[PDB]
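Entry 14: structure prediction run for Trp-Cage mini-protein. Input pasted below.
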Amino acid sequence: DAYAQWLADXGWASXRPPPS
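Run finished. Output tokens:
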């Protein structure tokens, strides 16, 4: 949804940082 989604979106490929 957010954290898992971030990692699934390429992690550091999206360009955006992890959701805290």
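Notes: The CA atoms of residues 1 and 8 lie 10 Å apart. Will compare against the previous run tomorrow.
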